[PDB]
Amino acid sequence: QSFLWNVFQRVDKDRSGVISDTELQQALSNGTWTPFNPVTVRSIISMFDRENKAGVNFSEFTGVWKYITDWQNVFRTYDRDNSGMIDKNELKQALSGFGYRLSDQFHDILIRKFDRQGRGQIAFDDFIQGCIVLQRLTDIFRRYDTDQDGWIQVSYEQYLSMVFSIV
């Protein structure tokens, strides 16, 4: 009750009562001393921001703290070598939760697309944003995956519909 509350305080610098995007960012660690991915921060904020205030109050921050510790739980387990980074061999073991098993060097496309560190591995902040994009893509896929076998057959319009429904 105060545990979640005394986390909210230490992250609220200007004491306005709202965790700003900048506040949550520099109160977060990707584990590489580089600034936490602002795109990742912006996403987690807007997910639990309900009055457009581009931030979260204690009510809204509870969802944020839960949403971020649940991701650290995921990151902690698949980071078996415990280097603070998820490598390709550890990525295969991680992205298994999306249903269809993916090819081995499809994990080289994902790691090229979402790694900002550029060291051929995936950090915690980039891991969250990557899955956010991935979940966004699979919701679009599941609409046409009625068959439920990981394969869809769509038209030209439906394809364009899928592309422009990314937002």
């Binding site: 230490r10 109160a27 977060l28 660690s29 584990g31 590489t32 703290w65 603070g84 915690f124 902040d125």
Partner: peptide, 12 residues
């Protein structure tokens, strides 16, 4: 010696 992934509480 960077802070572990996620929320950083004071004292690293």
């Amino acid at each position: 010696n960077p802070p572990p992934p996620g929320f950083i509480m004071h004292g690293n």
